[PDB]
Amino acid sequence: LANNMQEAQSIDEIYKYDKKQQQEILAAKPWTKDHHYFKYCKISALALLKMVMHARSGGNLAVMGLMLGKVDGETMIIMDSFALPVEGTETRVNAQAAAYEYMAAYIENAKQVGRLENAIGWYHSHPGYGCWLSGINVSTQMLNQQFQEPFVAVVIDPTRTISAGKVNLGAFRTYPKGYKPTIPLNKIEDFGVHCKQYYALEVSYFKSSLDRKLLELLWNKYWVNTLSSSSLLTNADYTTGQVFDLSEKLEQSEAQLGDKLAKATRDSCKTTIEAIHGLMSQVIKDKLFNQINI
């Protein structure tokens, strides 16, 4: 924990809110020009944890809520998530009367304490029903996007997440009216009949310096799973798939050349860095264990 910096780190400016910049970016409205504008959604660790806990706590029923944050450039930042007092069946949720009063009161109370962020989106949980936009979510997301432009639909699946051990969070945004534009068919199948109406987004997560510092001492028995990590063995299929997509991207960039090369180089660097990190861990293990009593 020493021989480094302990003050405001380079992962804390993401948590800083600038009112003037947000006002300028809201007045600019760069989203209306290119409709494929937003492509990245950065969610805080706290927001994701709260969303997953609330979705799982609902049991087999469906739950819904809001999420705060802001928007910068080509990315949407989602910082906090607060639930709603909704009473939904196994398929549909309504949020009839007490949900909106809760929204207004909670936003006002949060602004009282110091929460300077505004509402940035809504989320609703599919209890084992995959991760896609239904014919009602599409309509309500279009309704929200028509007037409150900075918005995003987050879909979470609690049952599948708890059964498979991996979170299933999907960020989506709807195209406006009249916007038309051995390989698996899941690309069309896993979406509803409105597959051409909405498009997904790249979901990433971030955490603060204090978040990582406190989570470093979260538990002191994963060291065994790190020493006997067995890297380059549990994700070989991942690396082969990455190599295949990298070859496809290289072919596309070569066709274009005859700026697309930048993302291909980035993907290649990422895959190679992962492989080199795995080899480094294996070399460290070999030096630690097998180089003793020779």
Binding site: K287, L288, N293
Partner: protein, 66 residues
């Protein structure tokens, strides 16, 4: 096989290469004056760990410099 049954050792025999591979064996009795012996070996292991740690630190420092 009958020694494997009593759980003193665990392993697999192999007739293709005519050898027995042992994965785990019990710790037999030790004399009073041989304890320092094992102590020495443990010390060696500790030293190795320290060395590895030092190397790692050097590496990361250099990386940051780059």
């Amino acid at each position: 096989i009958e020694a494997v049954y009593t759980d003193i050792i665990q392993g697999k025999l192999d007739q293709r290469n005519q050898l027995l591979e042992v994965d785990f064996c019990i710790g037999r009795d030790i004399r009073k004056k041989d304890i320092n012996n094992i102590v020495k070996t443990l010390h060696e292991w500790c030293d190795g760990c320290e060395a590895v740690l030092l190397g790692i630190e050097q590496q990361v420092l250099r990386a940051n410099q780059y």
